[PDB]
């Protein structure tokens, strides 16, 4: 059994983001143990949906899932470079778009931008995907799954963002099922990450993202399994 690179908690602040590398969380027991907010300054330390930047139009979005709940089956298909992600309305209470972190409202904006006939993809920021990946030293450890963009080649706008119904204790409510493409980006450099708020100081790490922004045609991370 072989392992990808594993970053200890005290090495996170200047780490690169590497496909399927593991980033260990803290041991203090408290909130600051969150590995994601240590890796990326500007990103909060809690939530399935996180963003950086002030304004309606963010600089970066992070999607985080624990992959533990069968009711909301988030998944990655490594052979297709496809990520299926459920939105932030997981309980009865408010309308699908009425959520504290505004994940669902933002998902709607991002997919509508992606499929818009005018200014297509204009407001879409880079999206980073992390999944919970417990290690011995920490249960808050995560794994980077890649840079992602809304939609998937061959999927219609009807299919890549669906309001699905669920029932909880007899109460019916809606939540988004969103489908993303994982880009062929093996690494996001520390230089890029430190230069999140300024494209001038960025390197070429996200060139496939900027290409997608221009054309709407993604260079997909296609990774067939070994037997």
Numbering used by the authors: -2 to 224
Tell me what the authors wrote about this structure, in their words.
SRA-like domains were recently identified in prokaryotes, where they serve as modules for the modified cytosine recognition by the modification-dependent restriction enzymes that protect host cells from infection by bacteriophages containing methylated, hydroxymethylated or glucosylated DNA. In summary, we show here that LpnPI recognizes the context of the flipped cytosine via several surface loops that act as separate DNA binding/recognition modules.
Here, we report the apo-structure of the DNA recognition domain of the cytosine modification-dependent restriction endonuclease LpnPI (LpnPI-N). The structure of LpnPI-N was solved at 2.1 Å resolution. The largest contact surface (∼750 Å2) is formed between the N- and C-termini of both A and B subunits that encircle the 160–170 β-hairpins of the symmetry related A/B subunits. This ‘pinching’ interaction, however, is not functionally important, since LpnPI-N is a monomer in solution. The overall structure of LpnPI-N is very similar to that of the SRA-like DNA binding domain of AspBHI (RMSD 1 Å over 170 CA atoms). LpnPI-N is more compact than the corresponding domain of MspJI (224 versus 260 aa). The loops connecting β3–β4, β7–β8 strands and E–F helices are shorter in LpnPI-N by up to 5 aa; nevertheless LpnPI, like AspBHI, contains an 8 aa insertion in the β8 strand that breaks it into two parts.
